[PDB]
C-alpha cells in the first residue's frame, strides 16, 4: 500500500475511555464492543460526536505488538458519569503527522513503520502516544480491502 503523509492539527475532544494491558491486538479488540454498551446504558442521552472520532492510544514507550498498553477512546459531545473503569477525560490537542491505512489490520504495522521513518527523514520528533483512528471496518464494509484506519503520530518540528 502507498502511504501518503499529511500534517494536521487535531483539536481537543471529550471521550469515554478504558485502558488495558493486552496480550495482542486480537485479544484487545474483543474487549471493545462491551465498552460502548456499558457506558451508554449508564448515561442515557450520551451522544457520539459527528463526525465520529474513535481511536486507540498506544502508550508504550517503544514499539511493541504483544503485552501492549492501550487505551480505547470514543469522542462524545459532553461528559457523562464514569462507569467502572470506563472514564471520561479530555484528550488534548496535538499536531500530528498522519497516514491512512487501507485494508485489514494484519498489516497495520506497515503504517507505523512508515510514519516512524517519515518523522526521522523530515526533522520531527514523536512527542505523545500514537493514535489509531477507526473509520471504516467490519461495522460498515464487508470488503475488508475498503477498511480505513488513520494512524496519527503527535509530533513537533526539531
Ligand atoms: C526514536 C523513536 C523510535 C521509535 C519510537 C516508537 C514509540 C512506539 C509508540 C507506541 C507503540 C506503538 C504500538 C502500535 C502497535 C499497533 N499494532 C498492534 C496495530 C501494530
Ligand atoms: C458473526 C461475525 C461476527 C462479527 C462481529 C462484528 C462486530 C462488529 C462490532 C464493531 C465495533 C467497532 C468499534 C469501532 C467503532 C465504529 N465507529 C468508528 C463508527 C465509531
Ligand atoms: C456495535 C456498533 C459498532 C459501530 C456502530 C456504527 C457503525 C456503522 C458505520 C459508522 C462508520
Ligand atoms: Cl527542514
How many Å apart are CA 103 and CA 146, to the nearest integer?
Answer: 6
Rounded to 5°, the CA angle 128-129-133 comes to: 125
Atom of ligand 3 nearest to the CA of 135: 11
Cell numbers at residue 119, please? 518523522
Cell numbers at residue 47, please? 451522544
How many Å apart are CA 61 and CA 17, to the nearest integer?
Answer: 20
The experimental method is: X-ray
CATH architecture of the domain with range 6-154 = Alpha-Beta Barrel (3.20)
Q: Which residues pair with 55 in a beta bridge?
A: 73, 133
How many Å apart are CA 72 and CA 140, to the nearest integer?
Answer: 19
Question: Of the bound ligands, which one is closest to the alpha carbon of residue 158?
Answer: 4
Q: Is the dihedral of CA 117, 111, 33, 22 positive or negative?
A: negative
Q: Which residues pair with 150 in a beta bridge?
A: 100, 133
Q: Which among 48, 140, 147, 150 is the best mutation to test ligand 3's pocket, defined by most ligand atoms within 8 Å of the CB?
A: 140
Resolution for the entry shown, Å = 1.4
3-state DSSP of 64-75: CCCCEEEEEEEE
How many Å apart are CA 91 and CA 82, to the nearest integer?
Answer: 16
Contact partners, residue 73, CB within 8 Å, separation at least 6: 15, 16, 17, 54, 55, 56, 57, 91
Atom of ligand 2 nearest to the CA of 133: 18
Ranges of each domain in the chain: 6-154
CB distance 48 to 75 below 8 Å: yes
Q: Give the CA count within 13 Å in the CB-facing half-sphere of 25.
A: 12
Amino acid at each position: 500500500m502507498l502511504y501518503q503523509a499529511a500534517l494536521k492539527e487535531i483539536p481537543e475532544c471529550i471521550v469515554y475511555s478504558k485502558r488495558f494491558i493486552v496480550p495482542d491486538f486480537s485479544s484487545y479488540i474483543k474487549l471493545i464492543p462491551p465498552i460502548g454498551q456499558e457506558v451508554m446504558k449508564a448515561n442515557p442521552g450520551l451522544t457520539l460526536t459527528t463526525p465520529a472520532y474513535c481511536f486507540t492510544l498506544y502508550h508504550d514507550k517503544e514499539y511493541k505488538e504483544k503485552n501492549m498498553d492501550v487505551e480505547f477512546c470514543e469522542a462524545v459531545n459532553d461528559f457523562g458519569k464514569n462507569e467502572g473503569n470506563i472514564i471520561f477525560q479530555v484528550i488534548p490537542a496535538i499536531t500530528a503527522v498522519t497516514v491512512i491505512h487501507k485494508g485489514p489490520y494484519d498489516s497495520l504495522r506497515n503504517a507505523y513503520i512508515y510514519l516512524m521513518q517519515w518523522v526521522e527523514d523530515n526533522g520531527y520528533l514523536l512527542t505523545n502516544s500514537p493514535r489509531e483512528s477507526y473509520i471504516d471496518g467490519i461495522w460498515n464494509k464487508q470488503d475488508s480491502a475498503e477498511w480505513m484506519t488513520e494512524i496519527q503520530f503527535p509530533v513537533e518540528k526539531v
